[PDB]
């Protein structure tokens, strides 16, 4: 039922969603698109509902599809310019979701309360596993489509820029302490928006094969250097190049992900080696020499 | 915790030196209480109490006390008061605004946002709750205080401050759990040995707490277990106990609880309590010649300090319990070696009339352990009998008879069950 | 021009001025204002919120500030009575307010 | 000790407070910092009495216990033209529909 028509409050709601995120996508927004969003969600909700709300998250995904094609239609493109495009995607939608949710927070509470993960796994609607039919807020869907947004331009140029930035462009500007700082910070920064996997994309997206090829390769390094490095000393050039990887990774941090590659090749290079080394241990005991024996220590 | 209580009155106090002894809330508490069954010495007890309301000024209790004051004053006026109540109200507003002072302080210190600042906030909060005699939200801080203690000294802080609270908080279950904790639980040996053979034993305060516990809890065994444990080197707590009351309290909980051997060990070989020992020469030689059995004057001063244990707020609530088990174990003491209880000289000792004597005994009959009987014309018992073997015989046959009884019962029960038998509802 | 104050405004420009200190509890003042948040306002009033209703809604925010300052739950904090009308429209206002 | 206060121009409300010892000139400089009118451009009222600038809120008779969240003491906020008196009118807040029997015991 006796309440009111509840399927006539989602038609115009979706229209405002498309005329906001995509309207001022990337650039700012302004109070015009503020209340455009607000009346957007109010029409998605004031229908005067129940049927507006489901159609409300409908037009939600629809016009967020809009505002984030403002942040994704420019991904079939060329070199790191689009890496910086993904950068700006994130960066624009920072203030985007900022003012969007700040002017939209009540509807954010409103149109989500049927199908989302935090409220709904199996009880009265699903967000726990899947329906292909969620119901969730503005930063929620933000990260949701974002990870899927983290594929087309990513696979396109960001993977290749990763590629052309982890062995042999050490010189000049790499990359410098903001390039793979930001890139690997992306890997950790796309961890679960439910916070379930606060580190999965770092082992997974950045941290393991760096231990892989940095260990294998750095053993290549210690090999050739022992070819041509005057061992006096071998331990000492070891200390040199290992610190090389330490500061090379003090540009790309990416924290913890790759280094937790750092633990991974030292045990390769002095745990598949010891014999001549621990022999070099009673020599300095026999012929001193604080530096060499110390580095032995 | 006031028991009605009759008189009723004993003139055997000295309250000036009591307030010298005790202090704070409990000071005026017992002042009031004693004054109640101590009229006309009620007078000065309550006078000095209300002047103690002139001390940190819980003037709600001022209200109550001068209420009683004018009550008993007019009641006095049969026999034959003048007070500065308005200036009291002025200083009352003074106090309340000082409350507000420290409240503003409190919220400032909330704003300080420091865990140790948090802790001292709890501290001083409960402090002034103590000060003006209204205490409630203080507990919250200490109810909150445990959330700010991690380290060993933090354990020290939580425990000693929760229980120093309990000095006037005065609540066993949780605070006894924390006595157990703070003595044992955190950092076993407490990481400090309770001050490593605690110089000032707050263990002593723990002891006082649990002792009042098994006062009310009445499990006075561990009570005396702690009472013996008196460690003088704590040396100071006006709310702890008067050493008169300290020793009398403890040792008489024991004198209820004990069996004579370990307690003489506890008593004759008491060392840690020896100062506490040497406190009351009265109660000292009381229990001495008690175990030496001069029952007459022992019981004499026993029910002479009747009135003054009454004069204890806390000895009052168990006077019957105490004197009960006292004369019980007086029996238990002397009677055990004999074979036929003569009364004549013995009654001359216990100072119970011949009938009252034998009816004490008749009581004894109600529970007593000796298979004993009396020629009343003997005026003398003969105590317990000899055989237990034949006793076993009779219990044996009683056994067998009820065995066969049950056995037929269960035969017939197998019948009734297996014969479908029951009773319908209608 | 942040000092402090935001302006929650009702009906025909009946402006309730809410201290920044309370405003931020709506986190809403702190965040809602942004698009251009950077301006030195501390000045926001309502343009539709009835005044007697809006008054209670913002009084809740003040009450929350007081409660917070108090910290220890209640130091002469009264019972937050709410008479009652509901509801029909208040639902939508409440939804927009979204505590 | 803050009397909770509404320093109101006609349709305008400074939702604020101040302890009883706060003088009116102090709060007027405060509202100056708030919306940029100095005490010579502001006038505090105890809803009828232009609160003298040296008058503290207790001196203004204000009691915080009465000047509260759901019941703050109302502060007349005139915008000083030193020749005139703004004469604060408490503009009545909007009204919803009638209290239903639905909320009544019926």
Short mmCIF file of C-alpha atoms in Angstrom, two decimals, chain A:
data_model
loop_
_atom_site.label_atom_id
_atom_site.label_comp_id
_atom_site.label_asym_id
_atom_site.label_seq_id
_atom_site.Cartn_x
_atom_site.Cartn_y
_atom_site.Cartn_z
CA UNK A 1 1.93 -3.13 -0.96
CA UNK A 2 0.00 0.00 0.00
CA UNK A 3 3.03 2.33 0.11
CA UNK A 4 3.40 3.77 -3.40
CA UNK A 5 4.67 3.06 -6.93
CA UNK A 6 8.19 1.72 -6.49
CA UNK A 7 9.35 1.10 -10.06
CA UNK A 8 9.10 4.72 -11.20
CA UNK A 9 12.04 5.91 -9.09
CA UNK A 10 15.08 4.76 -11.08
CA UNK A 11 14.48 6.00 -14.62
CA UNK A 12 15.79 9.54 -14.18
CA UNK A 13 18.18 8.41 -11.44
CA UNK A 14 20.39 6.62 -13.97
CA UNK A 15 20.26 9.62 -16.31
CA UNK A 16 21.99 11.82 -13.73
CA UNK A 17 24.65 9.14 -13.18
CA UNK A 18 25.69 9.35 -16.83
CA UNK A 19 25.68 13.15 -16.65
CA UNK A 20 28.20 13.34 -13.81
CA UNK A 21 31.11 10.89 -13.61
CA UNK A 22 31.56 10.86 -17.39
CA UNK A 23 30.37 14.47 -17.62
CA UNK A 24 33.35 15.91 -15.76
CA UNK A 25 35.48 12.76 -15.85
CA UNK A 26 39.16 13.39 -15.07
CA UNK A 27 38.71 17.41 -14.74
CA UNK A 28 36.73 18.89 -11.89
CA UNK A 29 33.97 18.40 -10.17
CA UNK A 30 31.83 21.47 -9.49
CA UNK A 31 28.65 22.05 -7.52
CA UNK A 32 26.58 21.73 -10.70
CA UNK A 33 27.59 18.09 -11.05
CA UNK A 34 27.38 17.87 -7.25
CA UNK A 35 23.64 18.41 -7.16
CA UNK A 36 23.40 16.65 -10.51
CA UNK A 37 24.71 13.57 -8.70
CA UNK A 38 22.54 14.29 -5.67
CA UNK A 39 19.28 14.63 -7.63
CA UNK A 40 20.56 11.66 -9.64
CA UNK A 41 20.55 9.42 -6.59
CA UNK A 42 17.42 11.05 -5.17
CA UNK A 43 15.53 10.16 -8.36
CA UNK A 44 17.14 6.72 -8.22
CA UNK A 45 15.66 6.56 -4.71
CA UNK A 46 12.66 8.90 -4.29
CA UNK A 47 10.78 6.56 -6.64
CA UNK A 48 9.82 7.21 -4.24
CA UNK A 49 10.83 3.61 -3.45
CA UNK A 50 11.69 -0.10 -3.64
CA UNK A 51 11.92 -0.37 -7.48
CA UNK A 52 13.98 2.81 -7.75
CA UNK A 53 16.72 1.43 -5.47
CA UNK A 54 17.53 -1.69 -7.48
CA UNK A 55 17.24 0.40 -10.65
CA UNK A 56 19.10 2.98 -8.57
CA UNK A 57 22.23 0.83 -8.30
CA UNK A 58 21.44 -0.01 -11.91
CA UNK A 59 21.80 3.59 -13.08
CA UNK A 60 24.61 3.70 -10.53
CA UNK A 61 26.69 1.18 -12.48
CA UNK A 62 25.40 2.74 -15.70
CA UNK A 63 26.53 6.31 -15.14
CA UNK A 64 29.61 5.17 -13.26
CA UNK A 65 30.31 3.23 -16.45
CA UNK A 66 29.87 6.70 -17.94
CA UNK A 67 32.19 8.63 -15.60
CA UNK A 68 34.76 5.83 -15.71
CA UNK A 69 34.73 5.55 -19.47
CA UNK A 70 35.76 9.11 -18.77
CA UNK A 71 38.52 7.15 -17.00
CA UNK A 72 38.75 4.09 -19.27
CA UNK A 73 37.90 4.85 -22.92
CA UNK A 74 41.50 6.01 -23.42
CA UNK A 75 43.26 2.69 -22.82
CA UNK A 76 43.75 1.40 -26.39
CA UNK A 77 46.71 3.65 -26.90
CA UNK A 78 50.49 4.13 -26.79
CA UNK A 79 53.44 4.29 -24.38
CA UNK A 80 53.59 5.42 -20.72
CA UNK A 81 51.49 8.45 -21.60
CA UNK A 82 48.69 5.96 -20.97
CA UNK A 83 50.52 4.65 -17.92
CA UNK A 84 50.18 8.22 -16.78
CA UNK A 85 46.63 7.98 -18.15
CA UNK A 86 45.89 5.23 -15.63
CA UNK A 87 47.62 7.47 -13.10
CA UNK A 88 45.23 10.29 -13.95
CA UNK A 89 42.31 7.83 -13.92
CA UNK A 90 43.07 7.11 -10.28
CA UNK A 91 43.97 10.72 -9.55
CA UNK A 92 40.88 12.36 -11.06
CA UNK A 93 38.57 9.85 -9.48
CA UNK A 94 40.22 10.58 -6.13
CA UNK A 95 38.45 13.95 -5.95
CA UNK A 96 35.73 12.38 -8.09
CA UNK A 97 34.58 9.79 -5.56
CA UNK A 98 35.48 12.40 -2.92
CA UNK A 99 32.84 14.94 -3.83
CA UNK A 100 30.56 12.30 -5.34
CA UNK A 101 30.28 10.33 -2.10
CA UNK A 102 30.32 13.47 0.03
CA UNK A 103 27.24 14.83 -1.76
CA UNK A 104 25.85 11.31 -2.33
CA UNK A 105 26.48 9.57 1.01
CA UNK A 106 22.88 9.10 2.11
CA UNK A 107 21.92 7.36 -1.10
CA UNK A 108 25.22 5.46 -0.77
CA UNK A 109 23.67 4.14 2.43
CA UNK A 110 20.32 3.72 0.71
CA UNK A 111 20.50 1.87 -2.62
CA UNK A 112 23.05 -0.72 -1.44
CA UNK A 113 21.24 -2.44 1.42
CA UNK A 114 19.97 -5.45 -0.58
CA UNK A 115 22.87 -7.05 -2.48
CA UNK A 116 26.43 -6.47 -1.33
CA UNK A 117 29.24 -8.45 0.27
CA UNK A 118 29.39 -6.80 3.69
CA UNK A 119 25.66 -7.28 4.25
CA UNK A 120 24.80 -10.18 1.98
CA UNK A 121 26.50 -13.52 1.47
CA UNK A 122 23.55 -15.93 1.52
CA UNK A 123 20.73 -14.41 3.61
CA UNK A 124 18.44 -11.86 1.88
CA UNK A 125 20.26 -11.28 -1.38
CA UNK A 126 23.79 -11.91 -2.51
CA UNK A 127 26.95 -9.91 -2.43
CA UNK A 128 28.83 -12.65 -0.68
CA UNK A 129 29.88 -14.68 -3.70
CA UNK A 130 28.10 -13.77 -6.97
CA UNK A 131 24.87 -13.04 -8.81
CA UNK A 132 26.29 -10.73 -11.48
CA UNK A 133 23.83 -8.38 -9.74
CA UNK A 134 25.44 -6.56 -6.79
CA UNK A 135 24.25 -3.43 -4.95
CA UNK A 136 27.02 -1.24 -3.54
CA UNK A 137 28.27 2.32 -3.17
CA UNK A 138 30.41 4.74 -5.14
CA UNK A 139 33.95 3.88 -4.03
CA UNK A 140 32.87 0.25 -3.72
CA UNK A 141 31.91 0.00 -7.40
CA UNK A 142 34.87 2.34 -7.93
CA UNK A 143 37.40 -0.32 -6.90
CA UNK A 144 35.23 -3.07 -8.41
CA UNK A 145 35.21 -1.77 -11.97
CA UNK A 146 38.67 -0.33 -11.28
CA UNK A 147 40.34 -3.71 -10.96
CA UNK A 148 38.58 -4.71 -14.16
CA UNK A 149 39.69 -1.27 -15.32
CA UNK A 150 43.15 -2.48 -14.26
CA UNK A 151 43.38 -4.78 -17.28
CA UNK A 152 42.87 -3.18 -20.72
CA UNK A 153 45.39 -0.29 -20.46
CA UNK A 154 47.44 -2.37 -18.02
CA UNK A 155 47.89 -5.34 -20.38
CA UNK A 156 48.28 -2.80 -23.19
CA UNK A 157 51.24 -0.63 -22.14
CA UNK A 158 51.81 -0.87 -18.39
CA UNK A 159 52.92 -4.50 -18.56
CA UNK A 160 55.32 -3.62 -21.38
CA UNK A 161 56.67 -0.66 -19.41
CA UNK A 162 57.21 -2.94 -16.43
CA UNK A 163 59.02 -5.21 -18.92
CA UNK A 164 61.23 -2.47 -20.28
CA UNK A 165 61.88 -1.38 -16.70
CA UNK A 166 63.15 -4.28 -14.56
CA UNK A 167 66.58 -5.54 -15.88
CA UNK A 168 68.64 -3.08 -17.91
CA UNK A 169 67.48 0.59 -17.78
CA UNK A 170 69.28 1.11 -14.49
CA UNK A 171 71.09 4.09 -15.92
CA UNK A 172 70.09 7.72 -16.06
CA UNK A 173 66.45 7.56 -15.03
CA UNK A 174 66.16 4.21 -14.52
CA UNK A 175 63.25 3.67 -13.27
CA UNK A 176 63.64 6.52 -10.79
CA UNK A 177 62.19 6.42 -7.27
CA UNK A 178 58.68 7.46 -8.39
CA UNK A 179 58.10 5.31 -11.51
CA UNK A 180 58.08 1.83 -9.99
CA UNK A 181 57.29 3.46 -6.67
CA UNK A 182 53.92 4.32 -8.15
CA UNK A 183 53.61 1.17 -10.26
CA UNK A 184 54.29 -1.28 -7.42
CA UNK A 185 52.26 0.95 -5.07
CA UNK A 186 49.50 0.19 -7.56
CA UNK A 187 50.05 -3.53 -6.98
CA UNK A 188 49.60 -3.19 -3.23
CA UNK A 189 47.02 -0.45 -3.62
CA UNK A 190 44.57 -2.71 -5.51
CA UNK A 191 44.37 -5.17 -2.63
CA UNK A 192 40.87 -6.24 -1.54
CA UNK A 193 38.42 -3.38 -1.02
CA UNK A 194 36.84 -5.79 1.45
CA UNK A 195 40.38 -5.85 2.95
CA UNK A 196 40.42 -9.66 2.78
CA UNK A 197 43.62 -9.74 0.73
CA UNK A 198 45.60 -6.71 1.91
CA UNK A 199 48.70 -8.09 0.16
CA UNK A 200 47.63 -10.62 -2.52
CA UNK A 201 48.39 -8.42 -5.52
CA UNK A 202 51.89 -7.75 -4.19
CA UNK A 203 53.03 -11.36 -4.10
CA UNK A 204 50.93 -12.01 -6.70
CA UNK A 205 51.17 -8.85 -8.79
CA UNK A 206 54.69 -7.65 -7.95
CA UNK A 207 56.74 -9.53 -5.40
CA UNK A 208 57.64 -13.14 -6.36
CA UNK A 209 59.27 -13.25 -9.85
CA UNK A 210 61.47 -10.30 -8.84
CA UNK A 211 63.06 -12.58 -6.28
CA UNK A 212 62.98 -15.00 -9.20
CA UNK A 213 64.95 -13.23 -11.91
CA UNK A 214 66.81 -10.88 -9.61
CA UNK A 215 68.21 -13.82 -7.71
CA UNK A 216 69.06 -15.81 -10.82
CA UNK A 217 70.41 -12.75 -12.58
CA UNK A 218 72.32 -11.41 -9.59
CA UNK A 219 74.01 -14.77 -9.31
CA UNK A 220 74.91 -14.15 -12.95
CA UNK A 221 76.34 -10.85 -11.72
CA UNK A 222 78.48 -12.42 -8.98
CA UNK A 223 79.64 -15.04 -11.48
CA UNK A 224 80.92 -12.63 -14.15
CA UNK A 225 82.33 -10.33 -11.51
CA UNK A 226 84.23 -13.24 -10.05
CA UNK A 227 85.47 -13.78 -13.60
CA UNK A 228 86.79 -10.28 -13.68
CA UNK A 229 86.85 -8.70 -10.21
CA UNK A 230 89.98 -9.50 -8.14
CA UNK A 231 88.23 -11.45 -5.35
CA UNK A 232 89.66 -9.00 -2.79
CA UNK A 233 87.97 -9.09 -2.45
CA UNK A 234 85.21 -11.29 -3.90
CA UNK A 235 83.26 -10.74 -0.69
CA UNK A 236 83.72 -6.98 -1.11
CA UNK A 237 82.39 -6.75 -4.66
CA UNK A 238 79.57 -8.94 -3.33
CA UNK A 239 78.86 -6.21 -0.76
CA UNK A 240 79.00 -3.67 -3.58
CA UNK A 241 76.52 -5.22 -5.98
CA UNK A 242 74.12 -6.39 -3.29
CA UNK A 243 73.90 -2.80 -2.05
CA UNK A 244 73.36 -2.00 -5.73
CA UNK A 245 70.15 -4.04 -5.68
CA UNK A 246 69.28 -2.53 -2.30
CA UNK A 247 69.21 1.03 -3.61
CA UNK A 248 67.89 0.11 -7.08
CA UNK A 249 65.04 -1.24 -4.96
CA UNK A 250 65.26 1.94 -2.90
CA UNK A 251 63.85 3.56 -6.01
CA UNK A 252 61.06 1.05 -6.81
CA UNK A 253 59.41 0.10 -3.56
CA UNK A 254 57.77 -0.77 -3.90
CA UNK A 255 57.82 -2.16 -0.35
CA UNK A 256 58.00 -4.93 0.50
CA UNK A 257 56.79 -6.92 -2.52
CA UNK A 258 59.91 -7.43 -4.58
CA UNK A 259 62.47 -7.49 -1.78
CA UNK A 260 60.56 -10.11 0.21
CA UNK A 261 62.95 -10.91 -3.77
CA UNK A 262 65.75 -9.53 -1.61
CA UNK A 263 65.63 -12.41 0.90
CA UNK A 264 65.16 -14.76 -2.06
CA UNK A 265 69.38 -14.88 -4.20
CA UNK A 266 71.73 -13.98 -1.41
CA UNK A 267 71.28 -17.48 -0.09
CA UNK A 268 71.76 -18.50 -3.72
CA UNK A 269 75.06 -16.71 -4.04
CA UNK A 270 76.55 -17.52 -0.62
CA UNK A 271 74.58 -20.69 0.05
CA UNK A 272 75.49 -22.36 -3.21
CA UNK A 273 79.02 -20.99 -2.60
CA UNK A 274 80.69 -21.15 1.05
CA UNK A 275 83.60 -23.45 0.32
CA UNK A 276 86.25 -21.12 -1.02
CA UNK A 277 84.63 -18.41 1.09
CA UNK A 278 84.75 -20.13 4.47
CA UNK A 279 88.25 -21.20 3.48
CA UNK A 280 88.99 -17.50 3.04
CA UNK A 281 87.80 -17.21 6.63
CA UNK A 282 91.72 -18.46 8.72
CA UNK A 283 93.60 -16.63 6.00
CA UNK A 284 92.88 -13.20 7.50
CA UNK A 285 93.15 -14.85 10.89
CA UNK A 286 96.58 -15.78 9.53
CA UNK A 287 97.11 -12.57 7.51
CA UNK A 288 95.07 -9.76 8.97
CA UNK A 289 93.29 -7.52 7.54
CA UNK A 290 90.25 -6.01 9.23
CA UNK A 291 88.24 -5.07 6.13
CA UNK A 292 88.31 -8.36 4.21
CA UNK A 293 87.84 -10.58 7.25
CA UNK A 294 85.19 -8.19 8.54
CA UNK A 295 83.15 -8.46 5.36
CA UNK A 296 83.67 -12.19 5.77
CA UNK A 297 82.09 -11.70 9.20
#
